[PDB]
Design a protein around this ligand. Sequence first.
Ligand SMILES: *[C@@H]1O[C@H](CO[C@H]2O[C@@H](C)[C@@H](O)[C@@H](O)[C@@H]2O)[C@@H](O[C@@H]2O[C@H](CO)[C@@H](O)[C@H](O)[C@H]2NC(C)=O)[C@H](O)[C@H]1NC(C)=O
Ligand SMILES: *[C@@H]1O[C@H](CO[C@H]2O[C@@H](C)[C@@H](O)[C@@H](O)[C@@H]2O)[C@@H](O[C@@H]2O[C@H](CO)[C@@H](O)[C@H](O)[C@H]2NC(C)=O)[C@H](O)[C@H]1NC(C)=O
Ligand SMILES: Nc1c2c(nc3cc(Cl)ccc13)C[C@H]1C=C(CCO)C[C@@H]2C1
Ligand SMILES: Nc1c2c(nc3cc(Cl)ccc13)C[C@H]1C=C(CCO)C[C@@H]2C1
Ligand SMILES: [Cl-]
Ligand SMILES: [Cl-]
Ligand SMILES: [Cl-]
Ligand SMILES: [Cl-]
Ligand SMILES: [Cl-]
Ligand SMILES: [Cl-]
Ligand SMILES: [Cl-]
Ligand SMILES: [Cl-]
Ligand SMILES: [Cl-]
Ligand SMILES: [Cl-]
Ligand SMILES: [Cl-]
Ligand SMILES: [Cl-]
Ligand SMILES: [Cl-]
Ligand SMILES: [Cl-]
Ligand SMILES: [Cl-]
Ligand SMILES: [Cl-]
Ligand SMILES: [Cl-]
Ligand SMILES: [Cl-]
Ligand SMILES: [Cl-]
Ligand SMILES: [Cl-]
Lengths: 563, 563
Amino acid sequence: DAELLVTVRGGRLRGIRLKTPGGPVSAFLGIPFAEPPMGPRRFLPPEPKQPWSGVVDATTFQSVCYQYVDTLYPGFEGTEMWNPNRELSEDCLYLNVWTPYPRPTSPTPVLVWIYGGGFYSGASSLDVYDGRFLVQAERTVLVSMNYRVGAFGFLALPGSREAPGNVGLLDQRLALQWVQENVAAFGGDPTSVTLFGESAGAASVGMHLLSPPSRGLFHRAVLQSGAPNGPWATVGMGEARRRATQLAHLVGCPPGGTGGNDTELVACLRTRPAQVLVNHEWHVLPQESVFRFSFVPVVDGDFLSDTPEALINAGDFHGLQVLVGVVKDEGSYFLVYGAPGFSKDNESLISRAEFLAGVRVGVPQVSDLAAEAVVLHYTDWLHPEDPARLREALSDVVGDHNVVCPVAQLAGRLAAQGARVYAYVFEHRASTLSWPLWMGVPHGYEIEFIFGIPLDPSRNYTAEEKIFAQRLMRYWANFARTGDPNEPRDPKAPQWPPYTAGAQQYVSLDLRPLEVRRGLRAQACAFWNRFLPKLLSATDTLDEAERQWKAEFHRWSSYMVHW
Amino acid sequence: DAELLVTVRGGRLRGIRLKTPGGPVSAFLGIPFAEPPMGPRRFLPPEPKQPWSGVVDATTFQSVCYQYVDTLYPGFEGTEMWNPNRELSEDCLYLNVWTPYPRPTSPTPVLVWIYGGGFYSGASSLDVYDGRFLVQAERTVLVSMNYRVGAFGFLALPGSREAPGNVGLLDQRLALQWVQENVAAFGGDPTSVTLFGESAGAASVGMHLLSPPSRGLFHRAVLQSGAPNGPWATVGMGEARRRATQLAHLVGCPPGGTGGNDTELVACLRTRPAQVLVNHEWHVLPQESVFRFSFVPVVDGDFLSDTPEALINAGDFHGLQVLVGVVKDEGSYFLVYGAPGFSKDNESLISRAEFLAGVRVGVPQVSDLAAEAVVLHYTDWLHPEDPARLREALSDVVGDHNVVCPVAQLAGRLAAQGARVYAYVFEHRASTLSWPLWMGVPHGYEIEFIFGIPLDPSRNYTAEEKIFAQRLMRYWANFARTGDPNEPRDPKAPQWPPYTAGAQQYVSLDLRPLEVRRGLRAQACAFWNRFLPKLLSATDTLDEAERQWKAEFHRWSSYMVHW
Ligand SMILES: *[C@@H]1O[C@H](CO[C@H]2O[C@@H](C)[C@@H](O)[C@@H](O)[C@@H]2O)[C@@H](O[C@@H]2O[C@H](CO)[C@@H](O)[C@H](O)[C@H]2NC(C)=O)[C@H](O)[C@H]1NC(C)=O
Ligand SMILES: *[C@@H]1O[C@H](CO[C@H]2O[C@@H](C)[C@@H](O)[C@@H](O)[C@@H]2O)[C@@H](O[C@@H]2O[C@H](CO)[C@@H](O)[C@H](O)[C@H]2NC(C)=O)[C@H](O)[C@H]1NC(C)=O
Ligand SMILES: Nc1c2c(nc3cc(Cl)ccc13)C[C@H]1C=C(CCO)C[C@@H]2C1
Ligand SMILES: Nc1c2c(nc3cc(Cl)ccc13)C[C@H]1C=C(CCO)C[C@@H]2C1
Ligand SMILES: [Cl-]
Ligand SMILES: [Cl-]
Ligand SMILES: [Cl-]
Ligand SMILES: [Cl-]
Ligand SMILES: [Cl-]
Ligand SMILES: [Cl-]
Ligand SMILES: [Cl-]
Ligand SMILES: [Cl-]
Ligand SMILES: [Cl-]
Ligand SMILES: [Cl-]
Ligand SMILES: [Cl-]
Ligand SMILES: [Cl-]
Ligand SMILES: [Cl-]
Ligand SMILES: [Cl-]
Ligand SMILES: [Cl-]
Ligand SMILES: [Cl-]
Ligand SMILES: [Cl-]
Ligand SMILES: [Cl-]
Ligand SMILES: [Cl-]
Ligand SMILES: [Cl-]
């Protein structure tokens, strides 16, 4: 075996060798890094794993954190890709290391993966998150970790010691602390740790940039199709107390006061089986919406000092290099979750009537006048009725609101405040794809290429896609290594320039070589980031004034019934 | 002379022969068609000209209606083009006929010209409104007429018999009635009368379509860079009483009541010299604005049954053919009248700060939130600071708001309700032009080509422009004759298709042959015509609610000063 035996601070580990077409890899999977967050420890921040006698079995992925299983489309190929492979447990706090073969002699750059899934789902075990190709190809160390999701990770009762919220992000931190201690045992270099995440994963990465307690734990960030300042990534304190109290209520838990609240609430909440908690998860979502999740990070003053957008503007970002991007059709897949017209089984050619309706679903909690504004902008007024154009439109609406425009605002604010930033649009549809053509390149389908999954011989990927992934892994590795993706020096391949606030350049990642484009959905984002709030603000002080007018006409009307 | 002697219902006339490069023309200019609207008759609708002993001298243009003379740029070539050539009088109600040589044997189509100039200026005598080329080339009869402008034509005290408003439009009507009676005396055919106007002229034409008393007086309409439903073309009853009462006040005229009001007001108003009235004309304009005029037609219930936009939607338009259009850079010239940054003497390269400011001037009387919306839409968010782009932007703002979007709404509403409509964009800059390049093809510079003025040898026009005008006159004549501009049949020249509500096709009139384009500033107009009102409506019921909140905090604050 040569070296599948490794000793980290807690104890000894036994790993497994993994085959790749290029060579081999040493993987150590399921390394416990926190005390199992069960019983009294549910909802509580992670305590570090006590050290162990014996040799820990690190030959296999540990069980997936307890979560909802998305089963809209039973037995569908492209839907079980993201579904939990290992069994479900609350005892799920484990991490995974892929290091080259043989273990490198000098300390080498580390990549740490944080998965997405709305903070309601996800696992480091998923076959698309296998680090063996990326490690074999770029000869760097890759670490991924499980973190608590759903209520188990994000249920907050802001200001209580028994459920303070954000523990899911604490899990992520604890693993990074583990990384500083134990990553050298694998040839890793705790002075060159680059965070990369996608979706909520990307939103997490962003929150670690914003929380000072984490800043000493990494040196670079990559945000894929997500941002800590997106509308679905954070919830207020008031709002999360409501959601957790509703969940408590559904599940049968009295609040009140003599000792607790809220200690007696959370105490009762821990007696509940995990499934009972997950059964009632989606009830607590306020509105009609798509791309919204019940339990997400809270702005509590603790982990996040202020709201992500606030911290973003204020922050100094010198000495940071961050790589940001999005897929071509971010919004597309979500519309099958209740936008009238959409299914994965027809070309979702919506009628204008269906367009207008879904605008209210894709953009939740907005006054009438606001959705008028979304329509105005996202309508081709030369083809208002055209069904294909209306389909792409509601898909850009959902994409721009949730992903492309939060990311674009961030990347501007960073770049202009000290960070060297590089932006990309990943616009290549996988040939192995199993979803309808109208979805295009949907949310999360760049991931399988970054991890060089095309190289897997069992998988039916094309030759130029294999090459594509290798180009992509190199881009990413050159980042983690140097904080610049475009090679050490300049080959014959076109150069990827930093995204800045003015020129706003970015690159297009598809089979064709790097094309530089100026403008990241610039015109759309002006609406979302600059104009819309000045509007919503007014409709807010107008829905307060139409409310005072019905109260003042109710008493007026009664003075008439007397007459 | 063969036939420069003609007898119309009122009496005999003596005309003059006019030379053109093609041949000759018989013109009869300054034919009195109403009793001079002076003394007791000021502000009163026109009475028809009593018949006369003798031979009336119709060899020369009669004096121009009393008006303000625009003298921003003293001694400027392109500014005195529109200035009054004949002397000024209130005795100005005269009309002009150009008929072919020799007088035609069969009754031939008639074109009636109504000049523009904001209802504050204009004259049928202006050298650019000479009918000799158009009549010689297309062998049709052309009639133009003076009509009262400014207070003398549009000062209203809605509902009084002594100043009922709209008399300027009554002047235009009276001439058309004259046309039914006397146009056959010249070879004209009172069953084929086509109205054509530009600017306020076009807005007038539009109002005759909307007033049933006029409908029996013409058969086709051409609207050039103007529409009866534009924001500057009509004023409310309340608003025009205010303007006329302010004017009365400035000029020293007591209102009140014992006999009149408002008879004693208007009585006093008639004692005033005409200049005293014109001195005080622009004081009565409410806001800060550009492209707004003091005295314009009033929606009184009389001439206009309801507001032009209202009448437009409701109306039946079958059996009507109307030809509509605009120049390339409608908005451009107006910005030198107070938009900060603009002069005809520099390239008006405004700063973004100047852009934001002029939006409030080009679009008057709009809430803060509304101008935010104008900015959002008219800003290239990839080049927000670019001065040339901001210059063109505020020019499209003024153009789209005042001209292109009112016209586009009209042409859609007509087409879709029975009229056969043809739309054009006149995008050719005159080579004789004397205004700065940044103005492009400005408001009113198609006129000189429609009247075939390039053919004038004294004028320094180019060969292909001469040809251009001839192509244009033919387009216009084929309309007046047949109600279809694109020839009787189909040559080798590309065919001009009717503008419709859906496809919205139009043509581009410049030196190059007809190019058909789909979409008449479609995306801009959605903002102006569909969205903006839903907004202004809300900011209206929000500025009423922020007003009730300061009244309710004034009494609240005093209950604190007591405490
Ligand atoms: C595209 O699909 C939707 C819904 O799903 C349809 O397509 C298949 C998945 C299959 O299950 C099929 O039987 C199913 O109806 C269609 O919209 C639905 O239309 C029905 C009436 O047919 C309504 O009563 C439903 O409310 C509505 N559901 C949704 C989710 O909108 C839609 O008609 C179809 N598009 C077309 C016209 O091809
Ligand atoms: C373009 O012109 C304007 C105003 O007119 C200027 O240009 C000539 C016509 C000449 O009369 C010249 O002397 C005159 O100033 C300029 O804007 C003006 O700037 C001055 C200060 O220089 C301000 O005090 C004025 O308020 C302001 N007036 C207007 C009408 O805006 C402008 O600077 C110029 N553009 C450039 C920078 O070339
Ligand atoms: N369950 C899915 C996921 C992702 N993408 C998906 C795409 C499709 Cl088409 C269908 C299903 C998908 C990417 C990640 C994001 C989410 C939700 C957004 O945080 C869940 C999971 C991981
Ligand atoms: N005084 C002018 C006029 C017109 N165009 C002008 C263009 C320039 Cl660049 C400068 C001056 C102009 C066209 C018509 C419209 C108006 C005002 C709009 O009803 C007045 C007059 C006739
Ligand atoms: Cl394997
Ligand atoms: Cl031991
Ligand atoms: Cl090595
Ligand atoms: Cl809050
Ligand atoms: Cl700021
Ligand atoms: Cl910072
Ligand atoms: Cl609509
Ligand atoms: Cl470095
Ligand atoms: Cl865009
Ligand atoms: Cl804005
Ligand atoms: Cl002459
Ligand atoms: Cl006589
Ligand atoms: Cl003839
Ligand atoms: Cl009114
Ligand atoms: Cl209607
Ligand atoms: Cl009608
Ligand atoms: Cl701004
Ligand atoms: Cl006919
Ligand atoms: Cl447009
Ligand atoms: Cl709208």
